[PDB]
Design a protein around this ligand. Structure first.
Ligand SMILES: [Cl-]
Ligand SMILES: [Cl-]
Ligand SMILES: [Cl-]
Ligand SMILES: [Cl-]
Ligand SMILES: [K+]
Ligand SMILES: [K+]
Ligand SMILES: [K+]
Lengths: 92, 103, 98, 96, 93, 103
Protein backbone atom coordinates (compact mmCIF):
# COMPACT_ATOMS: atom_id res chain seq x y z
CA UNK A 1 0.00 0.00 0.00
CA UNK A 2 2.03 2.94 -1.45
CA UNK A 3 0.37 5.45 0.78
CA UNK A 4 -1.26 3.77 3.80
CA UNK A 5 -3.79 5.73 5.89
CA UNK A 6 -6.23 5.62 8.78
CA UNK A 7 -8.22 8.72 9.82
CA UNK A 8 -5.65 11.52 9.60
CA UNK A 9 -2.56 9.32 9.98
CA UNK A 10 -0.51 8.81 6.74
CA UNK A 11 2.46 6.52 6.06
CA UNK A 12 4.66 6.15 2.98
CA UNK A 13 6.25 2.67 2.97
CA UNK A 14 8.91 3.58 0.33
CA UNK A 15 10.25 6.67 2.08
CA UNK A 16 9.09 5.67 5.57
CA UNK A 17 7.54 9.12 5.73
CA UNK A 18 4.65 9.69 8.17
CA UNK A 19 2.16 12.54 8.67
CA UNK A 20 -0.45 13.21 11.36
CA UNK A 21 -3.11 15.81 10.62
CA UNK A 22 -1.08 16.81 7.55
CA UNK A 23 2.16 17.49 9.50
CA UNK A 24 5.33 15.47 9.09
CA UNK A 25 6.40 13.14 11.92
CA UNK A 26 9.84 11.54 12.27
CA UNK A 27 9.76 7.94 13.40
CA UNK A 28 12.53 5.40 14.00
CA UNK A 29 12.28 2.14 11.98
CA UNK A 30 10.73 0.26 14.93
CA UNK A 31 8.23 3.06 15.55
CA UNK A 32 7.31 2.95 11.83
CA UNK A 33 6.90 -0.82 11.83
CA UNK A 34 4.72 -0.54 14.99
CA UNK A 35 2.49 2.23 13.60
CA UNK A 36 2.16 0.27 10.31
CA UNK A 37 1.06 -2.79 12.29
CA UNK A 38 -1.62 -0.77 14.10
CA UNK A 39 -2.82 0.88 10.87
CA UNK A 40 -3.11 -2.34 8.84
CA UNK A 41 -4.98 -3.80 11.78
CA UNK A 42 -7.10 -0.68 12.48
CA UNK A 43 -10.02 -1.46 14.84
CA UNK A 44 -8.56 -4.80 15.99
CA UNK A 45 -7.45 -5.23 19.60
CA UNK A 46 -3.80 -6.30 19.65
CA UNK A 47 -2.16 -8.02 22.63
CA UNK A 48 1.41 -7.33 23.66
CA UNK A 49 2.79 -10.79 22.70
CA UNK A 50 1.11 -10.39 19.29
CA UNK A 51 2.73 -6.99 18.77
CA UNK A 52 6.06 -8.33 20.03
CA UNK A 53 5.88 -11.23 17.51
CA UNK A 54 5.21 -9.02 14.48
CA UNK A 55 7.25 -5.89 15.10
CA UNK A 56 10.39 -7.51 16.56
CA UNK A 57 6.69 -7.05 26.79
CA UNK A 58 8.24 -3.92 28.32
CA UNK A 59 9.71 -2.92 24.95
CA UNK A 60 6.12 -2.92 23.53
CA UNK A 61 4.91 -0.61 26.31
CA UNK A 62 7.91 1.67 25.76
CA UNK A 63 7.38 1.98 22.05
CA UNK A 64 3.60 2.40 22.32
CA UNK A 65 4.44 5.29 24.64
CA UNK A 66 7.03 6.77 22.24
CA UNK A 67 4.61 6.46 19.33
CA UNK A 68 1.75 8.06 21.31
CA UNK A 69 4.01 11.04 22.09
CA UNK A 70 4.78 11.64 18.44
CA UNK A 71 1.47 10.84 16.78
CA UNK A 72 -1.37 10.96 19.35
CA UNK A 73 -1.52 14.05 21.63
CA UNK A 74 -4.45 15.93 20.03
CA UNK A 75 -8.05 16.36 21.19
CA UNK A 76 -9.23 13.08 19.66
CA UNK A 77 -7.02 10.12 20.54
CA UNK A 78 -6.59 7.23 18.13
CA UNK A 79 -4.33 4.86 20.09
CA UNK A 80 -6.09 3.31 23.06
CA UNK A 81 -5.31 0.97 25.93
CA UNK A 82 -7.67 -1.65 27.23
CA UNK A 83 -6.02 -3.46 30.13
CA UNK A 84 -5.37 -7.20 30.09
CA UNK A 85 -6.19 -7.40 26.39
CA UNK A 86 -3.79 -4.92 24.72
CA UNK A 87 -3.90 -1.90 22.39
CA UNK A 88 -6.17 -0.70 19.61
CA UNK A 89 -6.04 1.97 16.92
CA UNK A 90 -9.56 3.39 16.53
CA UNK A 91 -11.53 6.66 16.42
CA UNK A 92 -13.37 7.57 19.67
CA UNK B 1 14.30 11.43 -21.11
CA UNK B 2 13.59 14.91 -19.53
CA UNK B 3 11.56 17.03 -22.08
CA UNK B 4 8.77 17.31 -19.50
CA UNK B 5 6.18 19.55 -17.83
CA UNK B 6 4.48 18.15 -14.74
CA UNK B 7 3.21 21.30 -13.11
CA UNK B 8 -0.37 22.35 -12.50
CA UNK B 9 -1.45 25.90 -11.81
CA UNK B 10 -4.50 27.72 -10.58
CA UNK B 11 -4.25 31.50 -9.99
CA UNK B 12 -1.16 31.86 -7.76
CA UNK B 13 -1.03 28.23 -6.65
CA UNK B 14 1.62 26.05 -8.32
CA UNK B 15 1.97 22.28 -7.81
CA UNK B 16 4.65 19.85 -9.12
CA UNK B 17 3.15 16.38 -9.59
CA UNK B 18 6.54 14.68 -9.47
CA UNK B 19 7.99 16.24 -6.31
CA UNK B 20 4.73 17.21 -4.63
CA UNK B 21 6.18 20.65 -4.01
CA UNK B 22 3.60 23.40 -3.83
CA UNK B 23 3.86 27.18 -3.82
CA UNK B 24 1.25 29.77 -2.97
CA UNK B 25 1.98 33.31 -4.01
CA UNK B 26 5.58 32.27 -4.76
CA UNK B 27 6.13 30.80 -1.24
CA UNK B 28 6.67 27.12 -0.57
CA UNK B 29 3.91 25.12 1.11
CA UNK B 30 4.47 21.68 2.65
CA UNK B 31 1.53 19.29 2.05
CA UNK B 32 1.02 15.68 3.15
CA UNK B 33 0.13 13.27 0.29
CA UNK B 34 -3.57 13.43 1.19
CA UNK B 35 -3.51 17.28 1.29
CA UNK B 36 -1.67 17.24 -2.05
CA UNK B 37 -4.21 14.86 -3.63
CA UNK B 38 -7.02 17.02 -2.29
CA UNK B 39 -5.51 20.22 -3.64
CA UNK B 40 -4.91 18.56 -7.02
CA UNK B 41 -8.53 17.43 -7.11
CA UNK B 42 -9.77 21.01 -6.42
CA UNK B 43 -7.36 22.47 -8.97
CA UNK B 44 -8.28 20.02 -11.73
CA UNK B 45 -11.91 20.78 -10.86
CA UNK B 46 -11.65 24.56 -10.23
CA UNK B 47 -14.94 26.48 -10.30
CA UNK B 48 -16.94 23.27 -9.73
CA UNK B 49 -18.82 22.83 -6.46
CA UNK B 50 -17.76 19.48 -4.95
CA UNK B 51 -19.82 17.69 -2.28
CA UNK B 52 -18.12 15.81 0.52
CA UNK B 53 -19.14 12.41 -1.05
CA UNK B 54 -17.23 13.08 -4.38
CA UNK B 55 -14.12 14.26 -2.65
CA UNK B 56 -14.08 11.22 -0.40
CA UNK B 57 -14.54 8.97 -3.44
CA UNK B 58 -11.65 10.66 -5.27
CA UNK B 59 -9.03 11.63 -2.76
CA UNK B 60 -8.73 8.23 -0.99
CA UNK B 61 -9.17 4.63 -2.11
CA UNK B 62 -12.66 3.26 -1.54
CA UNK B 63 -11.08 0.84 0.99
CA UNK B 64 -10.05 3.84 3.19
CA UNK B 65 -12.16 5.26 6.08
CA UNK B 66 -15.35 6.45 4.39
CA UNK B 67 -16.53 9.33 6.52
CA UNK B 68 -17.33 12.88 5.33
CA UNK B 69 -15.88 14.01 8.69
CA UNK B 70 -12.33 13.11 7.47
CA UNK B 71 -12.95 15.17 4.39
CA UNK B 72 -13.94 18.16 6.49
CA UNK B 73 -10.79 17.73 8.60
CA UNK B 74 -8.54 17.57 5.58
CA UNK B 75 -10.16 20.53 3.89
CA UNK B 76 -9.50 22.44 7.17
CA UNK B 77 -5.79 21.35 7.19
CA UNK B 78 -5.38 22.32 3.55
CA UNK B 79 -7.03 25.72 3.92
CA UNK B 80 -4.78 26.60 6.86
CA UNK B 81 -1.74 25.92 4.71
CA UNK B 82 -2.74 27.17 1.26
CA UNK B 83 -5.59 29.69 1.75
CA UNK B 84 -4.51 32.10 4.42
CA UNK B 85 -4.35 35.38 2.51
CA UNK B 86 -6.88 38.15 1.90
CA UNK B 87 -8.66 36.73 -1.16
CA UNK B 88 -9.74 33.22 -0.30
CA UNK B 89 -9.78 30.70 -3.07
CA UNK B 90 -11.26 27.73 -1.22
CA UNK B 91 -14.91 28.33 -0.33
CA UNK B 92 -17.67 26.42 1.49
CA UNK B 93 -21.13 26.16 -0.06
CA UNK B 94 -23.08 25.21 3.05
CA UNK B 95 -25.07 22.01 2.50
CA UNK B 96 -23.58 21.53 -0.97
CA UNK B 97 -19.81 21.34 -0.52
CA UNK B 98 -16.62 23.20 -1.40
CA UNK B 99 -15.27 25.07 -4.39
CA UNK B 100 -11.91 26.44 -5.55
CA UNK B 101 -12.52 29.71 -7.32
CA UNK B 102 -11.79 33.40 -7.34
CA UNK B 103 -14.13 35.49 -5.13
CA UNK C 1 24.72 28.70 -17.81
CA UNK C 2 25.25 31.99 -15.88
CA UNK C 3 22.85 34.89 -16.60
CA UNK C 4 23.32 38.18 -14.79
CA UNK C 5 21.94 41.70 -14.80
CA UNK C 6 23.40 44.29 -12.35
CA UNK C 7 23.52 42.26 -9.03
CA UNK C 8 20.89 39.70 -10.04
CA UNK C 9 22.41 36.28 -10.89
CA UNK C 10 20.56 33.23 -12.31
CA UNK C 11 21.93 29.78 -12.90
CA UNK C 12 20.08 28.51 -15.96
CA UNK C 13 20.99 24.90 -15.05
CA UNK C 14 20.12 24.69 -11.35
CA UNK C 15 17.57 27.58 -11.27
CA UNK C 16 19.49 29.06 -8.36
CA UNK C 17 19.08 32.84 -7.99
CA UNK C 18 21.08 35.51 -6.06
CA UNK C 19 20.48 39.18 -5.43
CA UNK C 20 23.29 41.32 -4.01
CA UNK C 21 25.30 38.15 -3.52
CA UNK C 22 22.65 36.44 -1.34
CA UNK C 23 20.55 33.39 -2.30
CA UNK C 24 16.89 34.00 -3.08
CA UNK C 25 14.23 31.18 -3.24
CA UNK C 26 11.75 31.58 -6.11
CA UNK C 27 8.81 29.37 -7.24
CA UNK C 28 9.07 27.93 -10.76
CA UNK C 29 6.77 30.64 -12.18
CA UNK C 30 8.73 33.39 -10.39
CA UNK C 31 11.98 32.01 -11.86
CA UNK C 32 10.52 31.93 -15.37
CA UNK C 33 9.25 35.52 -15.01
CA UNK C 34 12.60 36.73 -13.68
CA UNK C 35 14.52 34.94 -16.47
CA UNK C 36 12.24 36.57 -19.07
CA UNK C 37 13.03 40.02 -17.65
CA UNK C 38 16.79 39.31 -17.49
CA UNK C 39 17.14 37.98 -21.06
CA UNK C 40 15.15 41.08 -22.09
CA UNK C 41 16.95 43.54 -19.83
CA UNK C 42 16.27 47.14 -20.89
CA UNK C 43 13.37 46.06 -23.17
CA UNK C 44 9.90 47.16 -22.18
CA UNK C 45 7.59 44.19 -21.85
CA UNK C 46 3.80 44.73 -21.92
CA UNK C 47 1.44 42.84 -19.56
CA UNK C 48 -0.19 40.90 -22.49
CA UNK C 49 3.30 39.91 -23.72
CA UNK C 50 4.41 38.62 -20.32
CA UNK C 51 1.08 36.90 -19.80
CA UNK C 52 1.24 34.99 -23.06
CA UNK C 53 4.97 34.24 -22.60
CA UNK C 54 4.90 32.91 -19.00
CA UNK C 55 1.35 31.60 -19.00
CA UNK C 56 -0.94 31.93 -22.09
CA UNK C 57 -3.18 34.72 -23.38
CA UNK C 58 -6.39 33.14 -22.03
CA UNK C 59 -5.04 32.69 -18.46
CA UNK C 60 -7.69 35.13 -17.22
CA UNK C 61 -9.80 35.37 -14.05
CA UNK C 62 -10.54 38.34 -11.76
CA UNK C 63 -7.21 39.92 -10.65
CA UNK C 64 -4.26 39.87 -12.99
CA UNK C 65 -1.71 37.24 -12.57
CA UNK C 66 1.10 39.32 -14.15
CA UNK C 67 0.63 42.16 -11.67
CA UNK C 68 0.51 39.63 -8.79
CA UNK C 69 3.69 37.82 -9.81
CA UNK C 70 5.56 41.05 -10.47
CA UNK C 71 4.68 42.04 -6.84
CA UNK C 72 5.84 38.68 -5.54
CA UNK C 73 9.07 38.87 -7.52
CA UNK C 74 9.79 42.47 -6.43
CA UNK C 75 9.33 41.49 -2.76
CA UNK C 76 11.86 38.68 -3.23
CA UNK C 77 14.38 40.22 -5.63
CA UNK C 78 13.98 44.05 -5.81
CA UNK C 79 15.03 44.92 -2.38
CA UNK C 80 18.13 47.06 -3.11
CA UNK C 81 18.43 50.77 -2.42
CA UNK C 82 18.25 51.12 -6.21
CA UNK C 83 15.21 49.41 -7.72
CA UNK C 84 15.72 47.50 -11.02
CA UNK C 85 12.14 46.35 -11.84
CA UNK C 86 10.17 49.36 -13.03
CA UNK C 87 6.54 49.98 -13.89
CA UNK C 88 5.80 52.03 -16.99
CA UNK C 89 2.14 52.96 -16.59
CA UNK C 90 0.01 51.91 -19.62
CA UNK C 91 3.06 50.36 -21.26
CA UNK C 92 4.38 47.51 -19.06
CA UNK C 93 7.47 46.77 -17.06
CA UNK C 94 11.21 47.04 -17.66
CA UNK C 95 14.30 45.67 -15.88
CA UNK C 96 16.96 48.45 -15.94
CA UNK C 97 19.45 50.26 -13.65
CA UNK C 98 18.33 53.67 -12.36
CA UNK D 1 20.25 -4.29 7.89
CA UNK D 2 18.25 -3.59 11.10
CA UNK D 3 19.94 -4.30 14.50
CA UNK D 4 18.10 -3.49 17.73
CA UNK D 5 18.50 -3.99 21.46
CA UNK D 6 15.77 -2.68 23.81
CA UNK D 7 15.14 0.87 22.36
CA UNK D 8 18.50 1.22 20.62
CA UNK D 9 18.21 0.82 16.81
CA UNK D 10 21.10 0.70 14.31
CA UNK D 11 20.91 0.61 10.55
CA UNK D 12 23.88 -1.48 9.46
CA UNK D 13 23.66 -0.01 5.92
CA UNK D 14 23.37 3.72 6.57
CA UNK D 15 24.96 3.74 10.08
CA UNK D 16 21.92 5.63 11.33
CA UNK D 17 21.26 5.21 15.09
CA UNK D 18 18.14 5.88 17.24
CA UNK D 19 17.60 5.75 20.98
CA UNK D 20 14.04 5.85 22.35
CA UNK D 21 12.84 6.60 18.85
CA UNK D 22 15.02 9.71 18.41
CA UNK D 23 18.02 10.04 16.01
CA UNK D 24 21.44 10.11 17.58
CA UNK D 25 24.63 11.29 15.76
CA UNK D 26 27.72 9.11 16.43
CA UNK D 27 31.30 9.29 15.09
CA UNK D 28 32.52 6.29 13.08
CA UNK D 29 34.37 4.91 16.13
CA UNK D 30 31.35 5.42 18.38
CA UNK D 31 29.18 3.55 15.86
CA UNK D 32 31.62 0.62 15.70
CA UNK D 33 31.77 0.44 19.51
CA UNK D 34 27.99 0.56 19.81
CA UNK D 35 27.51 -2.10 17.15
CA UNK D 36 30.02 -4.36 18.95
CA UNK D 37 27.96 -4.03 22.15
CA UNK D 38 24.63 -4.63 20.40
CA UNK D 39 25.79 -7.76 18.46
CA UNK D 40 27.14 -9.04 21.80
CA UNK D 41 24.18 -7.92 23.92
CA UNK D 42 24.21 -9.61 27.36
CA UNK D 43 27.86 -10.74 26.88
CA UNK D 44 30.47 -9.22 29.14
CA UNK D 45 33.24 -7.60 27.10
CA UNK D 46 36.58 -6.88 28.75
CA UNK D 47 38.51 -3.63 28.07
CA UNK D 48 41.40 -5.51 26.29
CA UNK D 49 38.82 -7.30 24.09
CA UNK D 50 37.07 -4.08 23.07
CA UNK D 51 40.39 -2.34 22.54
CA UNK D 52 41.74 -5.01 20.20
CA UNK D 53 38.33 -5.31 18.43
CA UNK D 54 37.63 -1.64 17.76
CA UNK D 55 41.24 -0.41 17.62
CA UNK D 56 44.20 -2.81 18.18
CA UNK D 57 45.96 -4.13 21.29
CA UNK D 58 48.88 -1.68 20.99
CA UNK D 59 46.89 1.58 20.84
CA UNK D 60 48.58 2.64 24.15
CA UNK D 61 42.64 0.99 27.63
CA UNK D 62 42.07 4.69 28.43
CA UNK D 63 40.67 5.07 24.92
CA UNK D 64 38.05 2.38 25.71
CA UNK D 65 37.01 4.14 28.90
CA UNK D 66 36.84 7.48 27.04
CA UNK D 67 34.71 6.16 24.18
CA UNK D 68 32.36 4.32 26.55
CA UNK D 69 31.86 7.68 28.29
CA UNK D 70 31.20 9.44 25.00
CA UNK D 71 28.80 6.73 23.89
CA UNK D 72 26.91 6.71 27.22
CA UNK D 73 26.44 10.51 27.00
CA UNK D 74 24.94 10.12 23.53
CA UNK D 75 23.01 6.84 23.84
CA UNK D 76 22.48 5.86 27.51
CA UNK D 77 20.22 8.64 28.53
CA UNK D 78 17.06 6.71 29.48
CA UNK D 79 15.67 6.34 32.98
CA UNK D 80 16.89 2.75 32.75
CA UNK D 81 20.56 2.50 31.85
CA UNK D 82 21.61 -0.23 29.42
CA UNK D 83 25.45 0.12 29.29
CA UNK D 84 26.86 -1.23 32.54
CA UNK D 85 30.29 -1.28 34.11
CA UNK D 86 31.41 -4.48 35.78
CA UNK D 87 34.41 -3.50 37.89
CA UNK D 88 37.57 -5.53 37.05
CA UNK D 89 35.66 -7.40 34.39
CA UNK D 90 34.50 -5.00 31.59
CA UNK D 91 31.22 -3.71 30.29
CA UNK D 92 27.92 -5.29 29.30
CA UNK D 93 24.88 -4.06 27.33
CA UNK D 94 21.78 -5.40 29.13
CA UNK D 95 18.31 -4.29 30.43
CA UNK D 96 18.25 -3.67 34.18
CA UNK E 1 44.55 25.24 -8.72
CA UNK E 2 41.79 22.97 -7.28
CA UNK E 3 42.64 24.40 -3.88
CA UNK E 4 43.54 28.19 -4.15
CA UNK E 5 44.73 30.36 -1.22
CA UNK E 6 46.13 33.72 -0.14
CA UNK E 7 46.87 34.46 3.53
CA UNK E 8 43.88 32.94 5.37
CA UNK E 9 41.49 33.01 2.39
CA UNK E 10 40.75 29.60 0.77
CA UNK E 11 38.79 28.76 -2.38
CA UNK E 12 37.79 25.42 -3.87
CA UNK E 13 37.25 25.89 -7.61
CA UNK E 14 35.38 22.57 -8.01
CA UNK E 15 32.79 23.03 -5.25
CA UNK E 16 33.02 26.84 -5.26
CA UNK E 17 33.55 26.56 -1.53
CA UNK E 18 35.31 29.46 0.25
CA UNK E 19 36.75 29.88 3.78
CA UNK E 20 38.16 32.91 5.64
CA UNK E 21 40.14 32.25 8.79
CA UNK E 22 38.99 28.61 8.61
CA UNK E 23 35.25 29.49 8.56
CA UNK E 24 32.96 28.79 5.64
CA UNK E 25 31.71 31.73 3.55
CA UNK E 26 28.85 31.54 1.04
CA UNK E 27 29.45 33.50 -2.15
CA UNK E 28 27.36 33.96 -5.26
CA UNK E 29 29.01 32.92 -8.59
CA UNK E 30 30.01 36.53 -9.41
CA UNK E 31 31.42 37.04 -5.89
CA UNK E 32 33.41 33.81 -6.33
CA UNK E 33 34.74 34.84 -9.73
CA UNK E 34 35.70 38.28 -8.33
CA UNK E 35 37.49 36.87 -5.23
CA UNK E 36 39.28 34.31 -7.51
CA UNK E 37 40.46 37.18 -9.73
CA UNK E 38 41.90 39.08 -6.74
CA UNK E 39 43.55 35.94 -5.30
CA UNK E 40 45.22 34.85 -8.57
CA UNK E 41 46.43 38.43 -8.90
CA UNK E 42 47.38 38.87 -5.20
CA UNK E 43 49.53 42.01 -4.68
CA UNK E 44 48.65 43.51 -8.08
CA UNK E 45 46.64 46.73 -8.27
CA UNK E 46 43.54 46.14 -10.39
CA UNK E 47 41.55 48.93 -12.04
CA UNK E 48 37.79 48.81 -12.32
CA UNK E 49 37.68 48.40 -16.15
CA UNK E 50 40.17 45.53 -15.81
CA UNK E 51 37.99 43.83 -13.18
CA UNK E 52 34.86 44.50 -15.24
CA UNK E 53 36.52 42.87 -18.31
CA UNK E 54 37.52 39.66 -16.53
CA UNK E 55 34.68 38.99 -14.11
CA UNK E 56 31.75 39.98 -16.37
CA UNK E 57 28.54 49.04 -15.15
CA UNK E 58 31.57 50.48 -13.31
CA UNK E 59 29.16 50.73 -10.38
CA UNK E 60 28.68 46.93 -10.53
CA UNK E 61 32.39 46.49 -9.65
CA UNK E 62 32.07 48.87 -6.69
CA UNK E 63 28.92 47.05 -5.56
CA UNK E 64 30.46 43.61 -5.68
CA UNK E 65 33.74 44.69 -4.08
CA UNK E 66 31.53 46.00 -1.27
CA UNK E 67 29.55 42.76 -1.02
CA UNK E 68 32.74 40.70 -1.02
CA UNK E 69 34.33 42.88 1.65
CA UNK E 70 31.29 42.34 3.89
CA UNK E 71 31.56 38.59 3.63
CA UNK E 72 35.31 38.02 3.66
CA UNK E 73 37.12 41.14 5.01
CA UNK E 74 35.76 42.60 8.33
CA UNK E 75 38.44 41.42 10.76
CA UNK E 76 41.31 43.25 12.40
CA UNK E 77 43.73 42.89 9.45
CA UNK E 78 42.14 43.89 6.16
CA UNK E 79 43.20 42.19 2.94
CA UNK E 80 41.12 44.01 0.31
CA UNK E 81 42.21 47.63 -0.18
CA UNK E 82 41.12 50.65 -2.21
CA UNK E 83 43.61 52.88 -4.02
CA UNK E 84 41.45 55.80 -5.17
CA UNK E 85 41.89 56.53 -8.87
CA UNK E 86 43.95 53.38 -9.46
CA UNK E 87 41.63 50.56 -8.30
CA UNK E 88 41.68 47.66 -5.79
CA UNK E 89 44.33 45.36 -4.40
CA UNK E 90 44.39 42.15 -2.40
CA UNK E 91 47.32 42.23 0.03
CA UNK E 92 48.35 41.99 3.69
CA UNK E 93 48.93 45.16 5.73
CA UNK F 1 34.69 -0.27 -5.62
CA UNK F 2 34.50 0.19 -1.78
CA UNK F 3 36.43 -2.39 0.34
CA UNK F 4 38.15 0.66 1.89
CA UNK F 5 39.43 2.34 5.06
CA UNK F 6 40.37 5.98 4.68
CA UNK F 7 40.29 7.08 8.28
CA UNK F 8 43.13 8.32 10.47
CA UNK F 9 43.00 8.37 14.26
CA UNK F 10 44.96 9.89 17.10
CA UNK F 11 43.64 9.49 20.67
CA UNK F 12 40.01 10.72 20.39
CA UNK F 13 40.46 12.55 17.10
CA UNK F 14 39.08 10.86 14.00
CA UNK F 15 39.55 12.11 10.44
CA UNK F 16 38.08 10.83 7.16
CA UNK F 17 40.47 11.56 4.25
CA UNK F 18 37.73 11.24 1.65
CA UNK F 19 35.04 13.48 3.13
CA UNK F 20 37.30 15.64 5.30
CA UNK F 21 34.91 15.05 8.19
CA UNK F 22 36.54 15.21 11.61
CA UNK F 23 35.36 14.24 15.09
CA UNK F 24 36.85 15.12 18.45
CA UNK F 25 35.62 13.09 21.41
CA UNK F 26 32.82 11.77 19.17
CA UNK F 27 31.56 15.27 18.20
CA UNK F 28 31.80 16.63 14.66
CA UNK F 29 34.29 19.38 13.88
CA UNK F 30 34.19 21.47 10.71
CA UNK F 31 37.68 22.26 9.32
CA UNK F 32 38.68 24.26 6.23
CA UNK F 33 40.98 22.36 3.79
CA UNK F 34 44.08 24.07 5.19
CA UNK F 35 43.03 23.26 8.83
CA UNK F 36 42.37 19.66 7.70
CA UNK F 37 45.82 19.38 6.02
CA UNK F 38 47.43 20.83 9.11
CA UNK F 39 45.65 18.40 11.47
CA UNK F 40 46.56 15.51 9.19
CA UNK F 41 50.19 16.60 9.23
CA UNK F 42 50.24 16.70 13.08
CA UNK F 43 48.44 13.34 13.30
CA UNK F 44 50.76 11.57 10.85
CA UNK F 45 53.62 13.12 12.82
CA UNK F 46 52.23 12.73 16.37
CA UNK F 47 54.79 13.03 19.17
CA UNK F 48 57.25 14.84 16.88
CA UNK F 49 58.09 18.48 17.57
CA UNK F 50 57.50 20.43 14.32
CA UNK F 51 58.99 23.86 13.68
CA UNK F 52 57.04 26.51 11.82
CA UNK F 53 59.32 26.11 8.70
CA UNK F 54 58.43 22.33 8.24
CA UNK F 55 54.76 22.92 8.69
CA UNK F 56 54.76 25.73 6.16
CA UNK F 57 56.67 23.56 3.66
CA UNK F 58 54.19 20.67 4.06
CA UNK F 59 50.77 22.15 4.61
CA UNK F 60 50.78 24.54 1.60
CA UNK F 61 52.43 24.49 -1.83
CA UNK F 62 55.81 26.20 -1.95
CA UNK F 63 54.20 28.76 -4.32
CA UNK F 64 51.83 29.83 -1.49
CA UNK F 65 52.44 32.78 0.95
CA UNK F 66 55.56 31.62 2.80
CA UNK F 67 55.25 33.32 6.16
CA UNK F 68 55.57 31.56 9.53
CA UNK F 69 52.93 34.04 10.73
CA UNK F 70 50.29 32.22 8.59
CA UNK F 71 51.27 28.98 10.28
CA UNK F 72 50.78 30.53 13.68
CA UNK F 73 47.33 31.83 12.62
CA UNK F 74 46.24 28.46 11.33
CA UNK F 75 47.50 26.57 14.35
CA UNK F 76 45.41 29.02 16.43
CA UNK F 77 42.31 28.38 14.26
CA UNK F 78 42.79 24.63 14.48
CA UNK F 79 43.34 24.60 18.26
CA UNK F 80 40.14 26.58 18.82
CA UNK F 81 38.20 23.96 16.93
CA UNK F 82 39.85 20.68 17.89
CA UNK F 83 41.66 21.26 21.23
CA UNK F 84 39.35 23.02 23.67
CA UNK F 85 39.04 20.12 26.14
CA UNK F 86 40.71 20.06 29.58
CA UNK F 87 43.43 17.72 28.35
CA UNK F 88 45.26 19.57 25.55
CA UNK F 89 46.76 17.53 22.70
CA UNK F 90 48.30 20.34 20.64
CA UNK F 91 51.23 21.94 22.46
CA UNK F 92 53.68 24.79 21.81
CA UNK F 93 57.40 24.27 22.37
CA UNK F 94 58.47 27.93 22.61
CA UNK F 95 61.38 28.59 20.23
CA UNK F 96 61.13 25.14 18.64
CA UNK F 97 57.56 24.65 17.41
CA UNK F 98 54.40 22.60 18.00
CA UNK F 99 53.61 19.01 18.89
CA UNK F 100 50.56 16.76 18.97
CA UNK F 101 50.84 14.45 21.95
CA UNK F 102 49.17 13.47 25.18
CA UNK F 103 50.33 15.75 28.06
CL1 LIG G 1 -5.97 5.54 0.51
CL1 LIG H 1 43.99 1.28 15.52
CL1 LIG I 1 38.34 -1.45 7.84
CL1 LIG J 1 48.46 25.95 -1.52
K1 LIG K 1 3.36 30.56 -23.12
K1 LIG L 1 40.90 -4.53 15.43
K1 LIG M 1 42.87 3.66 9.10
Amino acid sequence: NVRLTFADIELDEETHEVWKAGQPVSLSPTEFTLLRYFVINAGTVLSKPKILDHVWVNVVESYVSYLRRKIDTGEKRLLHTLRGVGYVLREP
